[PDB]
Amino acid sequence: GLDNQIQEIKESVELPLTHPEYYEEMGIKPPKGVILYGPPGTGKTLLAKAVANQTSATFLRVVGSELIQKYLGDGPKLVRELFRVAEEHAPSIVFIDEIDGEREIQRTMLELLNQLDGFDSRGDVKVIMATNRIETLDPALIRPGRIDRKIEFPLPDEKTKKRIFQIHTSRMTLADDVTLDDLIMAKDDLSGADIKAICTEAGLMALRERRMKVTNEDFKKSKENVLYKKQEG
Amino acid sequence: PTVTMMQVEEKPDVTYSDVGGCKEQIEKLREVVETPLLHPERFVNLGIEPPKGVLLFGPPGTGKTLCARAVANRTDACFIRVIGSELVQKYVGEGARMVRELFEMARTKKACLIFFDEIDAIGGARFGDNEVQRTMLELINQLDGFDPRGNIKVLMATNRPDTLDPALMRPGRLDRKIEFSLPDLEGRTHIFKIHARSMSVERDIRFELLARLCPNSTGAEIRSVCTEAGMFAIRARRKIATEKDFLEAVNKVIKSYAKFS
Amino acid sequence: DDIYKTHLENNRFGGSGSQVDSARMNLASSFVNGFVNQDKLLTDDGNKWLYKNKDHGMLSAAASLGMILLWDVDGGLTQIDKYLYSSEDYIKSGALLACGIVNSGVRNECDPALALLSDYVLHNSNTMRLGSIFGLGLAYNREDVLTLLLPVMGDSKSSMEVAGVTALACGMIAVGSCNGDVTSTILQTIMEKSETELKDTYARWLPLGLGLNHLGKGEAIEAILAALEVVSEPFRSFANTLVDVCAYAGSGNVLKVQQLLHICSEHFDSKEKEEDKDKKEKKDKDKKEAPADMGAHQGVAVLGIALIAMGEEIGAEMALRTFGHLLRYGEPTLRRAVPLALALISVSHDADPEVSYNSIFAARLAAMLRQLAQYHAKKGTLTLCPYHSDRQLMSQVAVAGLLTVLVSFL
Numbered sequence: 052g053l054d055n056q057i058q059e060i061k062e063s064v065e066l067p068l069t070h071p072e073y074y075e076e077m078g079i080k081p082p083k084g085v086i087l088y089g090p091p092g093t094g095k096t097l098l099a100k101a102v103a104n105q106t107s108a109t110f111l112r113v114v115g116s117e118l119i120q121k122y123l124g125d126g127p128k129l130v131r132e133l134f135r136v137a138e139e140h141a142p143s144i145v146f147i148d149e150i151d152g153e154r155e156i157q158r159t160m161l162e163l164l165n166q167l168d169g170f171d172s173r174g175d176v177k178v179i180m181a182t183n184r185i186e187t188l189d190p191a192l193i194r195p196g197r198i199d200r201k202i203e204f205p206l207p208d209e210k211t212k213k214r215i216f217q218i219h220t221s222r223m224t225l226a227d228d229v230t231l232d233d234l235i236m237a238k239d240d241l242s243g244a245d246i247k248a249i250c251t252e253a254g255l256m257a258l259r260e261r262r263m264k265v266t267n268e269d270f271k272k273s274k275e276n277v278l279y280k281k282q283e284g
Numbered sequence: 285p286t287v288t289m290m291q292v293e294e295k296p297d298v299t300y301s302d303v304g305g306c307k308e309q310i311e312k313l314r315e316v317v318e319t320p321l322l323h324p325e326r327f328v329n330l331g332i333e334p335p336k337g338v339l340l341f342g343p344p345g346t347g348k349t350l351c352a353r354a355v356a357n358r359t360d361a362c363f364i365r366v367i368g369s370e371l372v373q374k375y376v377g378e379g380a381r382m383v384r385e386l387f388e389m390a391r392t393k394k395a396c397l398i399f400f401d402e403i404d405a406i407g408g409a410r411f412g413d414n415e416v417q418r419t420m421l422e423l424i425n426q427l428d429g430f431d432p433r434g435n436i437k438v439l440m441a442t443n444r445p446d447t448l449d450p451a452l453m454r455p456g457r458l459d460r461k462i463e464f465s466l467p468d469l470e471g472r473t474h475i476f477k478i479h480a481r482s483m484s485v486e487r488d489i490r491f492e493l494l495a496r497l498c499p500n501s502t503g504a505e506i507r508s509v510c511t512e513a514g515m516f517a518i519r520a521r522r523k524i525a526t527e528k529d530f531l532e533a534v535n536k537v538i539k540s541y542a543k544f545s
Numbered sequence: 546d547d548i549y550k551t552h553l554e555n556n557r558f559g560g561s562g563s564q565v566d567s568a569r570m571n572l573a574s575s576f577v578n579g580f581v582n583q584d585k586l587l588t589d590d591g592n593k594w595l596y597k598n599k600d601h602g603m604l605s606a607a608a609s610l611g612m613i614l615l616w617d618v619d620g621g622l623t624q625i626d627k628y629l630y631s632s633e634d635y636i637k638s639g640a641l642l643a644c645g646i647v648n649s650g651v652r653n654e655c656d657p658a659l660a661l662l663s664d665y666v667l668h669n670s671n672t673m674r675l676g677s678i679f680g681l682g683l684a685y686n687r688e689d690v691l692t693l694l695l696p697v698m699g700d701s702k703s704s705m706e707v708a709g710v711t712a713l714a715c716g717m718i719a720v721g722s723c724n725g726d727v728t729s730t731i732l733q734t735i736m737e738k739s740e741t742e743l744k745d746t747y748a749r750w751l752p753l754g755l756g757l758n759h760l761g762k763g764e765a766i767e768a769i770l771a772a773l774e775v776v777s778e779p780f781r782s783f784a785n786t787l788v789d790v791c792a793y794a795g796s797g798n799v800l801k802v803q804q805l806l807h808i809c810s811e812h813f814d815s816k817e818k819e820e821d822k823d824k825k826e827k828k829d830k831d832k833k834e835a836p837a838d839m840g841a842h843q844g845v846a847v848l849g850i851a852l853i854a855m856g857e858e859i860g861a862e863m864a865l866r867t868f869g870h871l872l873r874y875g876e877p878t879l880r881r882a883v884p885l886a887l888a889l890i891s892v893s894h895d896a897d898p899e900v901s902y903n904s905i906f907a908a909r910l911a912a913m914l915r916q917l918a919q920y921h922a923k924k925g926t927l928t929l930c931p932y933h934s935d936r937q938l939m940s941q942v943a944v945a946g947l948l949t950v951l952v953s954f955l
Contacts, residue, residue, distance in 0.1 A: 062519055077483065079514050107896045109904075142904055158374050171286060 052207055053099075060085060060100060063200050064177050068142055069107055081199040082174025084145075089204045092183035094242035096204050097148055099215075109143040116151055124155045127162045134166060141175050148181040150188070160192070168195045183240070208235040215243045226254055226265035233274065240281045249273040291364045291386060299356035301478040304346050304467030304503060312462055313338045317354055317397065317437055337438035338460040341445050345466030346475070346503030348441070351399060361393065363437070368402025376415045380422055387432050397437040400427070403450065404442040424449065428457050466502050469495070475503050476510075483514045486526045494527050498538050509534055553583050561919050562587040569909045572602040573916035576949050579605065579612035580920055588613065595636070601942065603635035604642060604676065605949035611643020612949075621647035638672035645680015646950060652684060659693060665700055675710050675946070682714030683952050686722065691715060691730060698730050701737060705746045706947060708734070712754020713934065717952070720926050725759035725767045735775050738784075745780055746940070752784040753933055756791025760926070768792035779813060786816040790823040794924075801827065818846050822936070824854040826929075836863060840870060849879055852886055853936060857929075860890040872901065878939050881910045885935065888921035895922040928953045 063085055066074045074080070089096040101110070113133065119125065137145055167178060180196065182188060193201075212234060234246070253273045257265045303310050316335040320327055327334045340350070355362050364386055371379050390396045406416050425431065427438055438458060440450065454461070467475065472495035498506065512533040513525050522529060562574045575598060578587045588609060595606040607628050614621045621644065628640035644654045658677035664670040674697065681690065697711050715730055734751055742748070759767050768788045775781055793801055811817055828834050839851040852871050855864055868887045874880050884902065899922070902915045931951045938944050 066518070073518055077514055077518050079511070079518065081511075081515075105893050107893075107900070109897060109900055140904070142900060161373075170290070 052205060052210065053096075056202055056204065057100070057103065059200070060104075060202060064104065064144070064179070065108075067177060080174060082177070083169075083196070083199045084177035084179050085200045085202055086185075086193075086197050087179060087181040087202065088185040089183075091204075091206070091240045091242075092181075093240050094244060096202075097181045098242050098244055101146060101148075104144070109140065111137065111140065111143045111145050112148075113146060114148040116149060119159070124159065126155075126159045127166060130163055130166055137176060138172075143176060145176060145178040146181065147179065150180065150182040157189075160189070164192055164195055212238070212243070212246055216246060219243065219247055220250070224254075224263075225250055226257065226263065228265070228267050229270065230267065233271070237274070238277055238281075241277060245277060245280070249277060252276075287370055288382065288385065288389075291366070291389075293351075293355050293362050293365070296356045296362075298349055298352040298478065300353055302346065302349050302353060302475055302503065303471070304465075304475065305471035306465050306467075309462055309465060310350075312460060313340065313350075316460070317439075318357055320436060321358065321360065333434050334436065336434055336457050336459065338462060339440055339454065339458060340462065340464060341440070341442050342464035343466050344443055344502075344504075345464050346471075347443075347464065348401070349503055351401075354397075354399075358397075361396065363397035363399060364390065364393075365399035365401055368400075368405030371402075371419065372405040376419060379419050383423070383426055387426070390432070395436060399437065399439055401441045403440040403447060404444045407442065407447045407450070408444070410448070420449065424453055428453050430457070468499075472498065472501060472506055475506055479507075479510045482510055482525070483517060484524045486524050489525075489527045494534065498534065500542075501538060505538065508537055512537055548583050555584055555586060557919060558584055558587045561916050562590075567909060567912075568597070568599055568602075569913050570916060571598045572605060572945055573913040575602050575606035575609050576945075577916060577920040579609035579949065580954075581613055581615060582920070582923075585613060599942075600635050601945040601949075603633065604639040604672070604946045607636045607639025608643045608646060608676070608949060611640075611646035614643075614647045615954075618648055618651060634669045634672060638669060638676050640676075641673050642676025642680045642950065645677060645682075645684050649684050654684065655681065655690070659690070662693075662697075665696070665702070671702070671704065671707060675706055676950075678714045679710035679947075679950060682710075682718050683950070685718045686726075687718055690718075691728075695730060695733065698733050699737060701740075703744070705744065705750070706943075708747060708754075709750045709947065712751050713757065713931075713947075716754040716757025716760070717927075717930060719758045719760070720930055721761040722758065724762045724765040727767070727770075728758065731755050731758045735771075738775070738781065739777070742778065742780055746937075748780040748784055749787075749937060750934075752787035755784065756788050757930065759788065759791055760930075762792065762794065763796065765792070783813075783816055783819070786820045790819050790826075793823055793827050795827055795829070814844065814846050817844075818850060821847070821850045822853050824850065825856050829856070829924075836867075840867070845874075845876060845879060848874075849882060852879065852882055855886045855890055857886075857889040857892075860892070864890050865894070868898075872898075872905075877908065877910055880905070881914050882938065884911065884914050884918040885938075888918040891922060898922070928955070 067082070087097055087100065094101075104110075111133075118129065133145075137143065178196075180192075209231070213231060216231075229250070238246070249270075253265045253270055254263075256269060256273065257263065300310075316337050320334050324334070340347075351365055366383075366386065370382070386398065390398055406420055409416055409420065411417065434457060440447075445451070473491040476491040476495060494509075495501075495506075498509075501509075509530075513530045516522075516530050516533050517525055520529070527534070558578060561570075561577055565571050565574045571594070574587070575595075595603060598606050610624050610628070611621065614624060625640050625643050625647070628636050628643070631637050631640070641654070641658045644658070648654075654677075658673060658681065662670045662674045662677065678690075678694065678697070694711055694715060698708065698715075700707060702708070712731075712734065719726070731754065734754065738747070738751060755771070759765065768785075768791075771788045772785050776785055805821070808820060809817065824835065835854060837851070839847045842848070848871060851867065855867065858864070865887070868883060868890075871879065871883045872887070874883070884898075887898065899915065899919060902911065902918070906912070931953050934947050935944075935951070938948075
């Protein structure tokens with residue numbers, strides 16, 4: 052169940068310059084964008100909408116907060132770099148992903164909210180924030196940042212990965228006996244590139260033996276990667 | 285920083301017609317913010333010092349809209365508001381030179397009106413607090429103290445009346461503490477009367493009908509109603525807004541969002 | 546089969562034919578509209594759209610119905626006969642041009658076009674000589690039209706495109722001769738080329754007729770023959786290096802590589818442009834040697850040399866990687882020339898460069914060229930020969946009259 056969500060974010064962030072005649076005539080102008088958050092997250096809606104929105108646009112990749120926490124607290128200097136290159140790339144889409152001591156995270160998040168709010172510029176670029184859990188983020192970010200729309204992902208576990216699995220396996224070839232009860236029952240906090248990654252390493256693992264059929268025990272062996280990926284991080 | 289020049293609010297905005305049923309309270313606070321502007325010399329001829337300000341607090345409701353009202357109705361020179369978000373910041377102590385430089389700008393802008401929003405940021409110390417004691421005791425020495433002047437406008441807006449010191453220090457200089465009195469069943473139709481200048485409104489819409497089936501729907505939520513009206517009007521390619529079209533947006537935005545809140 | 550198994554949309558004909566203005570998007574819309582890539586709505590959109598276009602967009606837009614009719618031999622008669630015997634000159638001259646574009650084996654348009662060409666001074670038969678002689682060259686060692694072009698080669702008319710499409714027409718007719726030829730037409734324009742050395746554009750496109758008449762060589766010494774017979778002041782020495790470009794199709798001739806690096810630092814910055822411009826043909830198979838440090842220099846003309854040396858191949862990531870730094874430049878000649886090779890070498894990184902140029906400009910040159918890129922975003926003789934007519938865009942907008950009739954289309 053994501054058709055209304057993808058036409059609502061399609062109309063939400065594709066109303067600007069890409070087909071713009073329905074945006075600068077009515078006089079609404081919510082030039083703040085949405086903040087992506089998914090209960091599973093981890094590239095499912097982030098990657099799915101990150102590749103689905105690239106039909107005709109300019110993408111800006113910002114993934115992970117490691118470069119801030121792996122060393123001294125440089126802080127908002129790289130935010131100023133991405134803001135001057137986002138200023139030199141104004142008709143783009145600012146996509147910040149994987150937003151994951153606290154005395155400094157609060158001040159670089161306060162300065163991040165201040166510079167991100169558009170305190171020195173009007174609405175010209177669509178800023179998109181992304182995270183795994185929307186509850187870890189302090190509610191003080193919602194009012195300045197989100198004024199346009201926030202999207203929840205009410206996924207049906209069978210028909211989200213069975214519809215995405217069906218569409219994504221209707222053009223390419225695969226193997227038989229592909230079970231789904233352990234998938235919809237066990238998989239959590241993973242993406243569609245992960246079921247595509249285990250079908251690709253499943254059919255590729257069968258390709259190592261030069262076979263086109265995949266055994267159920269081989270699909271559980273590839274499933275173990277999913278079983279440990281959610282337990283590691 | 286750039287907030288010191290952001291304190292100026294040009295580009296006029298929402299006018300008097302967003303009064304949320306406070307037909308008398310808007311006089312009980314306009315009497316100090318806008319009345320001493322028409323004839324300031326006549327108050328000096330009266331002998332009494334011009335009034336200082338009032339106190340708005342209680343529920344949020346349609347808060348911060350009355351400052352835009354005070355921007356549009358003041359057609360002479362916009363005023364300066366000080367939100368409490370600039371007080372709770374790292375490396376405290378900047379608010380002293382900040383309030384002295386915005387008071388300096390107040391003396392430079394021929395007695396510019398000064399506003400103070402969100403006192404609850406540093407309010408309620410209940411004595412790490414000494415650095416707050418400096419900013420709030422100096423804040424009393426600069427606001428309740430007659431150092432700048434007993435003059436035109438002093439005001440504190442907040443969501444909690446738990447302020448210990450300002451409540452026992454205001455009666456000397458400040459006065460007229462009144463509740464917010466958010467609009468209920470008689471102000472939302474008038475917020476629709478100021479939203480009449482939005483996207484074309486068909487004369488079939490009854491503001492009372494759209495304003496009576498929405499409990500706890502102050503200017504923010506019905507502002508989102510008038511926002512989703514034009515938004516879904518773009519999503520449906522409609523040329524004129526009619527309540528019978530976006531009624532699903534109304535009962536959706538109040539009911540589907542009032543289920544979990 | 547292409548109409549059956551594949552289908553094209555109307556976003557580019559209707560879109561790029563609907564946001565037109567400033568009398569130049571009508572030019573680009575007339576050329577892109579002239580392209581076949583089934584739908585013929587923008588052509589049939591009422592009338593007077595050709596009337597609102599310029600004269601070169603009247604040759605291009607009058608030749609649009611011819612360009613969209615590379616097939617349907619019997620349709621070109623009933624489609625072009627409307628533009629025939631019209632009131633405007635470029636409508637009927639571009640109509641005979643379209644008669645030359647529609648087909649290449651019918652050859653029945655010879656007599657009506659050639660019958661009236663004998664005016665030679667200012668009549669409509671001069672533009673009908675452009676479209677009919679160049680278009681007839683596209684429809685073709687044809688010696689009857691060559692003897693008919695002998696007074697045209699000896700016309701010496703100040704109009705550049707007369708001997709432009711005449712030399713390019715006899716050359717494109719004679720591409721592939723056995724070790725070239727020394728015929729009396731290229732020799733005629735060599736002697737008359739020695740008569741008066743004016744209008745250097747003749748010293749740029751007449752050597753194209755020379756070297757295209759010399760096309761087909763594998764070891765011919767005609768470059769040394771002309772290097773002994775037609776050498777003079779730098780202009781005809783630039784003709785000599787044009788014959789050098791048309792004399793090195795490719796063999797084991799490392800002497801051209803040591804001579805290449807030897808003449809890489811010549812004062813004359815145009816023989817480097819052409820002699821180094823031949824890189825796309827000399828080393829066109831060992832693709833590892835083509836990438837060099839030409840962009841790191843300050844001779845922006847060399848950056849244009851590499852830009853031409855990109856080509857029209859599959860367009861790997863290294864190509865567009867060069868089209869990034871070549872795309873970011875201030876001069877309108879290289880910023881206008883980069884979307885041309887960028888569009889020719891490319892056939893979700895197609896509409897994104899268009900938004901990139903939208904980020905560059907937000908002139909009209911890059912607007913027409915960027916709509917040409919809007920269309921073209923998605924050893925052969927005819928598919929590679931007419932590029933040098935496009936390699937002389939650094940001039941007035943009059944190039945659109947000859948750029949619209951390229952035969953490199955598939």
